[PDB]
Structures are given as structure tokens and as C-alpha cells.
Amino acid sequence: ATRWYGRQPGHLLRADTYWIPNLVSQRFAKHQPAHWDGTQNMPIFRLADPKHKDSYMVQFR
Amino acid sequence: SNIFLELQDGDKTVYTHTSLIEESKQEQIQAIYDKVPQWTNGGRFLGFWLSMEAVNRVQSVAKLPIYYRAGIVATSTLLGGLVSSLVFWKSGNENQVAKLANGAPVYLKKWEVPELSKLYFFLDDDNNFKPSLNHHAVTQGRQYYKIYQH
Amino acid sequence: HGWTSMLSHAVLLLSCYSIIIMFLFILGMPTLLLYDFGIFFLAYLKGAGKYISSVAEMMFDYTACLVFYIRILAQWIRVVLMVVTFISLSHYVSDFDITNSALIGSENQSDSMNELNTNFSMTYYILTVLPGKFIYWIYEILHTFFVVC
Amino acid sequence: ILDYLFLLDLNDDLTRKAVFEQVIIFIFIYCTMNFLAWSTVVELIWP
Amino acid sequence: MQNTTNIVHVPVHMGHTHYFDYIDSFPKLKEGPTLEENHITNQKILREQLISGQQGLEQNLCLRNCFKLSQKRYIEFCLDRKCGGADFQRAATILGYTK
Amino acid sequence: MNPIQKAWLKILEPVSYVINEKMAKRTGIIGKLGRFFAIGPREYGVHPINRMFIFMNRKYMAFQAVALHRYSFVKSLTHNGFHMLRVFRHFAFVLPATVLAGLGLFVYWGDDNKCYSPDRFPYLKKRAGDMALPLNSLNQRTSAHYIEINAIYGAEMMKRYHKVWENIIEERSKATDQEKKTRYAHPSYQYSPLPVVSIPNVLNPLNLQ
Amino acid sequence: PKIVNPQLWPNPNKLRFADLYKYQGVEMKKINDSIKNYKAAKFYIGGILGGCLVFKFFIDAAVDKYIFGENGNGGKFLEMQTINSNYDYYYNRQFQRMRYLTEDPAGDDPLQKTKDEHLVDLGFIPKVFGANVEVRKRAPHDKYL
Amino acid sequence: TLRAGKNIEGSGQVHFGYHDQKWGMPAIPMFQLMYYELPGNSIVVNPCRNQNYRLYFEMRKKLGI
Numbered sequence: 052a053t054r055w056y057g058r059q060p061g062h063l064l065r066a067d068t069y070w071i072p073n074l075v076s077q078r079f080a081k082h083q084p085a086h087w088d089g090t091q092n093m094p095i096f097r098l099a100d101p102k103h104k105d106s107y108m109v110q111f112r
Numbered sequence: 113s114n115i116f117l118e119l120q121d122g123d124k125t126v127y128t129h130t131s132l133i134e135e136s137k138q139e140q141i142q143a144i145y146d147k148v149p150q151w152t153n154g155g156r157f158l159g160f161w162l163s164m165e166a167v168n169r170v171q172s173v174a175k176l177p178i179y180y181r182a183g184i185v186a187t188s189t190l191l192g193g194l195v196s197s198l199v200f201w202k203s204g205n206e207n208q209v210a211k212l213a214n215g216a217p218v219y220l221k222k223w224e225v226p227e228l229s230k231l232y233f234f235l236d237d238d239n240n241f242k243p244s245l246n247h248h249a250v251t252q253g254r255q256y257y258k259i260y261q262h
Numbered sequence: 263h264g265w266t267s268m269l270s271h272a273v274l275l276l277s278c279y280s281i282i283i284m285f286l287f288i289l290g291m292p293t294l295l296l297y298d299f300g301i302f303f304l305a306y307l308k309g310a311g312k313y314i315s316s317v318a319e320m321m322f323d324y325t326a327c328l329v330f331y332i333r334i335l336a337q338w339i340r341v342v343l344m345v346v347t348f349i350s351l352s353h354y355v356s357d358f359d360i361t362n363s364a365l366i367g368s369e370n371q372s373d374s375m376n377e378l379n380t381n382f383s384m385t386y387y388i389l390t391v392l393p394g395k396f397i398y399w400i401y402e403i404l405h406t407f408f409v410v411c
Numbered sequence: 412i413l414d415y416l417f418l419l420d421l422n423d424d425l426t427r428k429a430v431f432e433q434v435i436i437f438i439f440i441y442c443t444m445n446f447l448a449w450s451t452v453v454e455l456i457w458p
Numbered sequence: 459m460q461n462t463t464n465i466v467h468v469p470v471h472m473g474h475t476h477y478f479d480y481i482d483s484f485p486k487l488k489e490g491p492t493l494e495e496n497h498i499t500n501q502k503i504l505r506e507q508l509i510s511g512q513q514g515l516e517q518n519l520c521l522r523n524c525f526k527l528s529q530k531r532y533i534e535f536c537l538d539r540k541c542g543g544a545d546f547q548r549a550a551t552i553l554g555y556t557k
Numbered sequence: 558m559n560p561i562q563k564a565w566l567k568i569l570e571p572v573s574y575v576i577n578e579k580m581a582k583r584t585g586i587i588g589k590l591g592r593f594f595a596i597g598p599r600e601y602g603v604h605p606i607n608r609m610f611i612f613m614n615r616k617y618m619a620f621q622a623v624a625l626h627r628y629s630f631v632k633s634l635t636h637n638g639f640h641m642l643r644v645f646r647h648f649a650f651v652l653p654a655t656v657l658a659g660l661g662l663f664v665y666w667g668d669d670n671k672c673y674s675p676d677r678f679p680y681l682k683k684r685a686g687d688m689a690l691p692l693n694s695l696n697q698r699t700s701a702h703y704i705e706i707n708a709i710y711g712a713e714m715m716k717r718y719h720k721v722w723e724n725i726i727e728e729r730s731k732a733t734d735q736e737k738k739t740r741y742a743h744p745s746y747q748y749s750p751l752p753v754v755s756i757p758n759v760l761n762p763l764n765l766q
Numbered sequence: 767p768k769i770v771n772p773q774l775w776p777n778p779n780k781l782r783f784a785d786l787y788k789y790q791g792v793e794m795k796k797i798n799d800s801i802k803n804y805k806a807a808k809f810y811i812g813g814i815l816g817g818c819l820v821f822k823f824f825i826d827a828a829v830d831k832y833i834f835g836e837n838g839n840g841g842k843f844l845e846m847q848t849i850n851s852n853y854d855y856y857y858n859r860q861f862q863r864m865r866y867l868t869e870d871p872a873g874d875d876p877l878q879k880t881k882d883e884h885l886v887d888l889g890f891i892p893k894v895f896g897a898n899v900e901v902r903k904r905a906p907h908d909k910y911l
Numbered sequence: 912t913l914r915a916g917k918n919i920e921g922s923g924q925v926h927f928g929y930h931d932q933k934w935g936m937p938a939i940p941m942f943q944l945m946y947y948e949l950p951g952n953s954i955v956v957n958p959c960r961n962q963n964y965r966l967y968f969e970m971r972k973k974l975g976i
């Protein structure tokens with residue numbers, strides 16, 4: 052049960068200046084209003100998981 | 113479209129919000145409020161042009177201190193914008209938004225007017241997870257004043 | 263950049279910002295130079311026109327202003343060459359061979375120490391194969407030094 | 412009273428950009444670097 | 459057993475990239491309406507519920523609160539005491555719990 | 558010498574008389590103790606931290622004067638004062654803006670000063686005793702509304718149960734032993750009386766209300 | 767203040783040895799120069815603190831505007847934005863469903879569970895069931911992920 | 912992990928057995944451009960939490976506050 056609850060991914064901010072591709076690309080990104088759909092788990096950012104397509108450059112050790 | 117409307121319900125002055133109107137008519141209301149600055153700024157130009165033509169070519173105002181001449185152009189500039197804004201609304205637009213708000217709920221006080229985008233709701237499992245205002249913390253209801261008719 | 267290792271979560275943070283600063287302020291140098299020339303700026307680049315047609319000269323002036331910026335912007339391919347050459351050397355060194363056969367009293371018994379490990383390369387390994395890997399290493403760094411300098 | 416004062420917010424900066432918290436780190440590093448470099452140049456005219 | 463071992467019940471696709479390991483895509487992943495299209499959809503549902511779905515609401519909320527009790531005998535006591543003497547099966551049909 | 562050292566000397570004036578006048582000039586263990594703890598001005602009393610600030614303040618201030626004393630970018634735009642061709646005029650305010658940003662160097666130090674820390678993961682590890690937590694610990698949470706509302710609800714309903722509890726005890730006191738044992742009893746139970754004993758009827762064993 | 771002297775040794779003559787008595791004075795002289803700066807900075811620092819006192823009242827009205835809004839229904843505090851595209855959002859939702867359907871092997875330790883041999887000796891002979899081979903695990907609604 | 916109920920023999924993360932190891936990031940620019948350590952301050956509470964304040968604004972208007 053503990054391992055299963057731990058795999059439900061946490062929310063990790065998209066804003067990142069540590070990776071040089073995001074440091075350049077995010078200067079041209081447009082922040083759009085994320086309309087609330089009635090939930091408490093809207094993944095409007097990236098997810099704190101090593102296998103996520105926007106978090107693979109992060110070292111989860 | 114976040115606009116608070118002040119409608120004339122006979123003798124009462126009722127209030128509502130554009131979020132309480134269907135999206136098909138919110139676009140027509142927003143289009144009217146978008147042409148107000150075009151009439152306001154356009155009227156400011158005429159008030160600035162006609163005033164500059166009078167304080168220079170009319171040799172009765174030209175023989176005056178510059179501070180008096182600049183005050184006329186300054187006064188006629190913003191006065192030309194306030195007049196054009198009145199002609200815009202009073203012609204057919206102040207009554208068009210009233211007709212576009214037909215069927216929307218109104219309230220006696222502005223403080224009682226809710227914004228539909230700011231209301232709390234939940235996904236009702238008992239109704240195919242549709243969004244519902246009748247969440248498990250609601251006690252009585254909304255009970256607006258009346259439906260606007262124009 | 264060694265002295266900035268603990269200043270943030272990225273060791274190369276200052277370097278990644280500096281390459282952006284270096285690109286933007288170098289890009290603005292030709293722009294500010296054309297502003298200093300004034301409205302005659304096209305005469306400073308190409309010189310005197312040849313045809314009476316302003317539309318014809320407009321095309322030649324559009325090229326001179328483009329060439330004026332290409333002389334600067336195309337030089338960043340040199341920086342790309344220096345980075346690629348530096349990465350290829352780092353890839354060769356990071357993947358260079360190191361095994362338990364070079365360790366003194368190894369305890370990594372599960373890392374091929376107790377397994378039958380034959381190969382299909384040339385024999386006399388330290389005389390033929392190992393010097394060959396070092397010869398290519400010297401080429402990688404000598405080619406890198408020549409490029410980056 | 413105006414909405415321009417909303418720029419003073421850092422409690423809910425993650426709702427809009429969350430970029431301020433990382434850029435100032437570089438600026439503080441950049442000031443430290445220029446401090447070490449510029450003080451060396453201007454002071455070392457004395458020998 | 460390997461400490462990093464997971465069993466997944468839905469298909470995933472891994473990236474074929476050097477130095478990185480991640481899930482780059484999900485097979486047959488369809489994109490629904492945007493966050494703005496869903497918002498407009500929900501506003502239309504909430505607007506009709508605000509204008510035409512507020513009369514007789516106090517009675518239905520009492521029936522719903524009574525049916526969240528643990529035991530059935532407490533539900534019948536709640537309906538009789540708080541809901542003006544409503545019937546169990548009759549209120550269950552109103553709320554939509556009857557098959 | 559500083560005023561704080563002078564303030565110590567006024568308070569230690571009687572102590573200075575016991576050690577320096579009496580104990581210091583004696584012999585033996587009392588003499589060695591007095592000469593060792595003699596009171597006066599400090600040998601090696603300099604404060605290196607205070608001196609470290611004065612040095613770094615003067616060195617960093619000379620850098621501020623260089624970085625802030627720049628020729629204006631605005632004045633060089635007209636080509637009429639001191640600057641005709643300045644191809645790097647757009648760098649003129651980078652050093653001043655960088656120095657002015659250094660004023661918040663200590664105001665915004667670390668993660669907690671740049672955001673609302675209770676909404677970040679490291680705050681949870683600190684409240685758990687500097688203990689590692691799973692990365693999704695900020696999500697698996699019970700409603701703070703429930704914890705506080707239920708705490709009030711339970712205590713408010715306990716006051717209303719206490720009033721009902723008194724009416725039940727009083728009504729059961731006036732009930733026959735036959736009634737208090739057959740009511741709420743199992744249907745299969747046949748009542749048989751017990752010998753009458755004297756057992757007091759105490760509401761609260763401790764003398765509480 | 768006067769310092770008690772044990773008189774264990776005679777101090778050098780001030781006229782013959784003047785350098786030995788100077789450090790104390792120049793040290794307090796430095797502090798006096800710093801106090802002149804502290805006093806002269808009273809109006810500059812006070813003007814800033816006075817500005818903060820006036821700025822406090824505008825920040826109060828801006829916070830209530832930020833939180834409550836125009837008509838007390840909520841201001842820009844309720845706004846949240848994102849740079850995720852529509853594909854990025856539905857990838858994250860499916861990533862949430864995938865982790866919900868991500869289990870580990872072998873479950874828990876069977877030796878920490880009630881034995882069937884113990885139930886027989888306690889008076890309850892358990893019935894053996896077959897494996898439910900027809901059920902398919904699925905993710906719940908997004909509100910529960 | 913020990914408090915969570917998993918006894919630990921040995922120590923460290925240099926797994927002797929059949930496990931994947933994760934060495935420290937090589938302190939060379941190649942790996943320092945591809946990777947960066949996980950900043951714990953970037954793991955946040957979802958902003959949908961702020962939408963619960965909608966209940967407060969509605970309760971205040973119902974109570975005439």
C-alpha cells in the first residue's frame with residue numbers, strides 16, 4: 052500500500068532555468084489560463100516522475 | 113467576458129453579470145464594449161482637431177495667452193470623447209445590451225451578483241460526473257430576484 | 263566555472279546564461295551601428311547606387327543589410343563546431359575502458375570477475391589493441407585543441 | 412490599490428510563472444563574478 | 459528481485475534516446491477538448507443549474523444527507539425526523555438510487 | 558576599546574578590586590589564580606568578524622562605485638554629447654542594475670525566502686524531523702476542513718449528549734430491577750430476580766458536574 | 767573608567783614610550799566617525815521608513831483586491847495558468863492513470879496473514895475459491911487520480 | 912526505508928547484486944548540460960487548492976458579512 056501511494060506522481064514545476072533548452076525555449080512560451088475543471092489534481096505542470104517526458108533530464112536519486 | 117451590467121427594470125435598478133448570459137450573446141455584448149474606445153478615442157481626435165483649428169485660425173482666440181489656448185484644446189479634447197461615448201450608447205447600444213440580457217437573472221444589489229466562473233462546484237458521481245453547484249456543503253439555494261425581461 | 267559549483271543546482275548555470283548574453287549583445291552591435299550611421303546607413307554598407315529605379319536598388323540594399331548581419335551571425339557555426347568537438351572528446355573519455363583487470367585487490371566479484379570473458383579482437387592486447395585506443399585518444403584531443411583554438 | 416502592486420506577490424508565484432525564484436540566483440552570481448573581476452582591474456593600477 | 463521493478467497494466471512506449479530513459483508516448487492517446495472548451499461546456503451546465511435548478515432544492519439536499527448515514531435504520535429515522543416523513547424507496551427513486 | 562568594554566569595567570569594579578588588588582599580588586595558588594584572571598583591557602581583544610566586515614565593505618563599495626559610474630545610454634542616442642559611435646551602449650546599465658539587485662542578496666537567500674515555503678516539499682521534510690518523504694507527500698492529505706470542523710463538531714455534540722445522558726440515568730433510576738433487566742434484553746432471556754443489595758447511584762465517581 | 771593595577775611591574779614612561787599608549791585612542795576615534803554617519807543618516811533612513819508606513823495602506827487595499835476581487839467573489843488570486851499544450855495535459859492525465867494501474871509484484875507477505883490451518887483448529891473450515899480471471903483493472907475518474 | 916518496514920543489510924547504493932546502480936553525475940560539462948539534480952523546492956502543492964477559497968467568499972455573502 053505504501054509503495055502504491057508513492058508512485059502516484061507529485062507535481063513538479065515546469066519553470067526551469069537549469070536545463071539550457073528550457074532556459075531558451077520558455078522565453079517564448081505563452082502562459083495560458085488553466086481553467087479549473089473541479090478537481091484537485093490538475094496536472095498543469097510536469098510530474099515528479101523519472102519517466103515523465105518533461106522530467107527525464109532530472110536526476111531522481 | 114467579465115462585465116457587471118446595470119439594467120433598468122422599470123423603477124428598480126437591477127444588476128447582473130455577463131457570465132449569467134449564454135456565450136452566444138456574451139460575444140455580442142463584448143463587441144459593443146470593444147467599440148466604445150474606438151468612439152471615445154475617435155471623438156477625442158475631433159475635439160482636438162476642431163479646437164486646434166479654432167485657437168489658431170480664428171483671430172480672436174489666437175490673441176490670447178497660450179495657457180488659455182491650451183486649456184480650450186485640452187477641455188475640448190476629453191469633452192469630444194465623452195460626447196461620442198454618449199452618442200454611442202444612447203443611439204442603440206445601451207438598449208441593445210438590455211435586449212441581449214433578456215432571460216438573465218438579475219439582483220437588487222450589486223453585491224449579490226455572482227460570477228459563474230468564481231462559483232464552487234464539484235463533479236457529481238451520481239450524475240455521470242457532471243459539474244454541479246449543489247455540492248455537499250450547500251444548505252438552502254441561490255434564490256435570485258427575477259429573470260430580466262426586455 | 264569551478265568556484266560556482268555550490269551557488270546553484272546547476273554547475274554551468276552562469277555559463278548557460280553567458281552564452282545567451284553573448285549572443286544577444288553581439289546581435290545588437292550591428293543594429294546599434296546602423297543606428298549610428300543614420301538614414302544614410304545603406305550608403306555606408308553598399309555605397310552609391312547604380313540604377314535610377316528605387317525599387318531595383320531596394321532589392322540590392324536588402325541584400326547588403328542581410329550580408330551585413332550574416333557576416334556576424336554565420337560565425338556562431340564556429341561555436342557549434344567547438345561544442346560538438348568538445349562533446350565527442352568527453353564521450354570518448356567517459357566511455358573509455360576500465361575493468362577489474364586494472365584494479366588492485368578488487369572486491370567487485372559480481373562484475374565479470376568470476377565469469378569466462380573471451381573476446382574476438384586481436385591478441386597481444388596491451389601491445390596491439392590498447393595502444394590503438396590510446397592513439398585514437400591522442401587524435402581526439404589534438405583535433406579538439408586545433409578546432410577550439 | 413492598483414493591480415500593478417500584485418507584482419509584489421511571492422506566495423502564489425507558482426500560479427503565474429515561478430521564474431523569479433530562479434533568475435535572481437543567476438543575478439546574484441553575476442554580481443559576485445563582476446565584483447571579483449572589476450575590483451581586481453581597478454585596484455591593481457597601484458603597483 | 460530488481461528493486462526498480464514495476465508491473466504496468468496499460469501499454470507504454472519508451473524513448474530510444476541515448477543517456478535518457480522515459481515514457482515518450484502512450485499508444486492510441488486521444489486528446490479531448492481543451493481546458494477552455496471544457497470550461498465553456500461546464501459554464502453552460504452550471505448556468506442552467508443556477509437559473510432553473512434551484513427550486514425544491516432544500517428537500518433534495520435533506521434526502522441526500524440522510525442517505526449518507528451508515529445504517530439503514532438511521533436513514534429511516536433521518537427521513538422521518540428531518541425530511542417531513544419521506545419513504546425510503548420513494549426518496550431513493552428521487553435521488554436515482556433505484557434500479 | 559569600545560563602550561561595551563567600558564560598561565563591563567563599571568560593573569566589575571568591585572570584582573576588579575578583589576582579583577587585582579588582593580588576589581593578584583599574593584603567592585601560591587591564590588596568586589596564580591588572580592594573575593590569570595586579572596581584569597583590564599583585553600590582550601588580543603580585536604574582533605576579527607568586525608574587521609572582516611570593514612574589509613569586505615570597503616572592497617565591495619569600491620566595486621559599486623565603478624559599476625554605477627557609467628556613461629548614460631540615453632545621452633549617447635543623440636550623438637551630441639561625448640558619444641558619436643558606441644556599439645555597446647546597450648550594455649551601459651547592466652552593471653548598475655546588477656549592483657542594485659545585490660541589495661536583495663540576503664533578503665532572498667535560500668528557497669524559503671523566495672516563495673511561500675509551506676507549499677513546497679522541503680517544508681514537509683522539516684516538520685517530519687528532517688526525514689525523507691516520498692515526493693508526492695504534498696498530495697496525499699486529509700482535508701484540513703475535516704480535521705478542524707470535526708474537532709468542533711464532536712465537542713459540541715458531546716455537550717448535547719451529556720444532557721441526554723442525564724435524562725437517561727435519571728429515568729432508569731426510577732425503573733424496577735425487573736424493567737431495567739428485561740428492557741433491551743435478548744428475547745431468549747428468562748428473567749430471574751437477584752437478591753436485593755445496596756448499590757449507590759453515583760453520577761460521576763469523581764465529584765464533578 | 768579607572769582600571770585597577772596590580773603594580774606587578776612599572777609601566778613605561780609615557781614621554782619616553784608614547785607609541786605604547788596610542789592604540790586605544792585611535793580605536794575609539796574610528797567609532798566616533800561611524801557615529802557621525804549614523805546620526806547624519808537619520809533623515810534618509812527615516813524617510814524610507816516613513817514611505818513604508820504609507821506604502822502599507824496601499825498594500826492592504828491591494829491584497830483585498832487581489833483576493834476578494836471587485837464584488838467579493840474572488841480576484842486574480844483564483845487564477846492559475848500553464849504552458850502545457852493540450853497534448854501535454856492529456857499525456858499527464860494518462861500518466862496518472864498509468865501510475866494508478868502500476869502495481870508491484872508478489873503483494874505482501876503471506877506469512878503475516880491468517881492461516882487456513884489455524885482456522886480449521888478454531889472451528890471454521892474455509893472454502894477454497896478459484897481465481898477471478900475475467901476482471902480487468904481500470905483507472906477511476908480523473909478527480910480520484 | 913528502515914522506518915517504513917524494510918530491514919537493510921549492508922549500506923550504500925553500490926548494489927553488489929542484480930540491481931541497477933546510479934553513480935553520481937560526472938562533474939564534466941557533458942553530463943552537466945544533460946542532467947541537473949532534482950530541486951525539492953520545485954515540488955509544489957497543486958494550485959487547485961486555492962479554489963477552495965470560493966467556499967469562503969460564498970459563506971461570507973450568505974452570512975451577510
Ligand SMILES: CCCCCCCCCCCCCCCCCC(=O)OC[C@H](COP(=O)([O-])OCC(O)COP(=O)([O-])OC[C@@H](COC(=O)CCCCCCCCCCCCCCCCC)OC(=O)CCCCCCCCCCCCCCCCC)OC(=O)CCCCCCCCCCCCCCCCC
Nearest residue numbers: 289292293294295296297298299300301302303327328331
Ligand atoms: C519582427 C521584428 C521586426 C523588426 C526587427 C528589427 C527592429 C528595427 C528597429 C531598429 C531601430 C529603429 C529605430 C530607428 C530610430 C529612428 C529615430 C529617428 O527618427 O531619427 C531620424 C534618423 C534620421 O536622421 P539622421 O540620419 O540622424 O540625419 C538626418 C539628416 O539630417 C536629414 O537630411 P535630409 O533633410 O536631406 O533628409 C531628407 C528626408 C527625406 O526623406 C524621404 O525620403 C521623403 C520620403 C517621401 C515622403 C512623401 C512625400 C510626398 C510628396 C507629395 C507631394 C504633394 C504636393 C504636390 C503638389 C501640391 C501643390 C499645391 O530624409 C529624412 O530626413 C527622413 C529620415 C527619417 C526616417 C525615419 C526612418 C525610421 C522609421 C522606422 C519605422 C519603424 C520604426 C519601428 C521602431 C519600433 C521599435 C523597434 O533615422 C534613422 O537614423 C534611421 C536609422 C535606422 C537604422 C536601423 C536599421 C536596423 C536594421 C533593421 C532591419 C534589419 C534587417 C535584417 C534582419 C536580420 C535578422 C536580425
Ligand SMILES: CCCCCCCCCCCCCCCCCC(=O)OC[C@H](COP(=O)([O-])OCC(O)COP(=O)([O-])OC[C@@H](COC(=O)CCCCCCCCCCCCCCCCC)OC(=O)CCCCCCCCCCCCCCCCC)OC(=O)CCCCCCCCCCCCCCCCC
Nearest residue numbers: 380381382383384385386387388389390391392393394395
Ligand atoms: C640454413 C637455414 C637454417 C635456418 C632455417 C630456418 C630459418 C628461419 C625460418 C623461420 C620459420 C618460421 C618460424 C616459426 C617459428 C615462430 C615461433 C614464434 O615464436 O612465433 C611467434 C610469433 C607470434 O605469433 P603467435 O604468438 O603464435 O600468435 C598467433 C597469431 O599471430 C595471433 O594472431 P593475432 O592477430 O591475434 O596477433 C597479432 C599479431 C600482430 O600483428 C603482427 O603480425 C605484427 C606485424 C608487424 C611487423 C611486420 C614488420 C616486421 C619486419 C620489420 C623489419 C623489416 C626489415 C626490412 C625492411 C625492408 C623494407 C622493404 O601478432 C602479434 O601480436 C605479434 C606480437 C609478437 C611479436 C612482437 C615483437 C617482436 C619483437 C620485435 C623486435 C625484434 C628485435 C630483433 C632482435 C633479434 C633477436 C630476437 O609469430 C610470428 O610473429 C611469426 C614471425 C615470422 C618471422 C617474421 C620475419 C621477421 C623479420 C625480422 C627482420 C629483422 C631481422 C632480419 C634477420 C635476417 C636473418 C636472415
Ligand SMILES: CCCCCCCCCCCCCCCCCC(=O)OC[C@H](COP(=O)([O-])OCC(O)COP(=O)([O-])OC[C@@H](COC(=O)CCCCCCCCCCCCCCCCC)OC(=O)CCCCCCCCCCCCCCCCC)OC(=O)CCCCCCCCCCCCCCCCC
Nearest residue numbers: 290625627628629630631632633646647648649650651653
Ligand atoms: C505622480 C508622482 C509625481 C509625478 C511628478 C514628479 C516626477 C517627475 C519625474 C521625476 C524623475 C523621473 C526620472 C526619469 C525622468 C528624468 C528625465 C531625464 O532627463 O533623465 C535623464 C537621465 C540622465 O542620465 P544619467 O543621470 O547620466 O544616468 C541615468 C541612469 O543612471 C542610467 O542611465 P542609462 O541611459 O544608462 O539607462 C539605460 C536604461 C534605462 O533604464 C530603463 O529605462 C529601462 C528600459 C527598459 C524598457 C525598454 C523598452 C524597449 C522598447 C519596448 C517597446 C514597447 C513597450 C511596451 C511596454 C509594455 C509594458 C508591459 O535603459 C536601457 O538599459 C536600454 C537597453 C535595454 C536593453 C535592450 C532592450 C531592447 C532590446 C530587446 C527588444 C525585445 C523585443 C524585440 C521585438 C519587439 C517586437 C517587434 O537618464 C535617465 O533616463 C534617468 C532614468 C533613471 C531611472 C529613474 C527612476 C527613478 C524612480 C522612479 C520610479 C521608476 C520610474 C520609471 C519606470 C519606467 C518603467 C520601467
Ligand SMILES: CCCCCCCCCCCCCCCCCC(=O)OC[C@H](COP(=O)([O-])OCC[N+](C)(C)C)OC(=O)CCCCCCCCCCCCCCCCC
Nearest residue numbers: 294296297298299300301302631633634635636637641642
Ligand atoms: C502606441 C505606440 C506608438 C506611438 C507612436 C509611434 C512613436 C514611436 C514608437 C515609440 C518608440 C519609443 C521607444 C524608443 C524611444 C526613442 C529611442 C531613440 O533612439 O530616440 C532617439 C532620437 C534621437 O534622434 P536624433 O535625430 O536627434 O539623433 C540621432 C542621430 N543618429 C540617428 C545618427 C544617431 O530621438 C527620438 O526621440 C526620435 C523618435 C521620435 C519619434 C517621435 C514620433 C512623433 C513625431 C512628433 C509628432 C509629429 C506630429 C506632426 C507635427 C506637426 C508640426 C508641429
Ligand SMILES: COC1=C(OC)C(=O)C(C/C=C(\C)CC/C=C(\C)CC/C=C(\C)CC/C=C(\C)CC/C=C(\C)CC/C=C(\C)CC/C=C(/C)CCC=C(C)C)=C(C)C1=O
Nearest residue numbers: 606609610611612613614615617618621656659660662663
Ligand atoms: C548597501 O551597499 C552594500 C554595502 O555597503 C557598501 C556592502 O558592504 C555589502 C557587502 C555586505 C557585507 C560585507 C556584509 C556581509 C554579512 C554577511 C554575509 C552576514 C553577516 C552575519 C553576521 C554578522 C552574523 C550576525 C549574527 C547574528 C545577528 C545572530 C546573533 C545575534 C543576535 C541573536 C542578536 C539579536 C538581534 C537583535 C536583538 C536585533 C537588534 C539589533 C541590534 C544591533 C541590537 C544589538 C544589541 C546588543 C546588546 C549588542 C552589500 C551586499 C551592499 O549591498
